[PDB]
Each structure stands twice: as structure tokens, then as C-alpha cells.
Amino acid sequence: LVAAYPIVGVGMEKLIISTNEHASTDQGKTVSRATTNSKTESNTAGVSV
Amino acid sequence: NVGYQNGFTANVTTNYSHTTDNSTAVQDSNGESWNTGLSINKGESAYIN
């Protein structure tokens, strides 16, 4: 009575923001920050307790 | 550490990579650094082959 089919998604780890497409050495500077994600966050945005 | 005080006689690691993750250990570096062989300043790059 229980179906068997998988549920698959993508999750990000760290952001990198730059000014030009290849500006990593000579055409400016970049920034980079490590993140964490969570599956169910928009499910509890509409909870007005 | 020195002793165990139980019948374990084994050690616990925190990283358990298999035999497909291997790290190349250089030999005959001979003291001479990497950067003193190629003229590289602060804002430069280098390429690997």
C-alpha cells in the first residue's frame, strides 16, 4: 500500500560573487561565503501562531 | 594515547575515506621552495599539468 518512487533535489553549499566572468586574477576581485541549507523552510513561513 | 583500560585495543578515527581518495606526497623537495623557481608576485596565477 506504500508506493516506491524517489524524490530528488539540489542544494547549494557556498556562494561566489564576482564582477566580470573571468575577473579572478587581473580584472577585479571576488567574494565567497559558505552557507547551509534546509529542506522545509517555506512550509513554516505561512504559519501564523 | 598510552592506555585503554578496557578490552578494546583499537583506535577510533574521524575520517574514513576508502582507497580511492589518495594524497600525493612529494619527495626530493630539497629545501628549495615552490615560489623561488618561477617569478610570481601577489596578484598572479600558475597552471598545473
TrEMBL record, chain A:
It comes from the Bacteria. The chain holds residues 293 to 341 of 876 of the full protein. This is ADP-ribosyltransferase binding component.
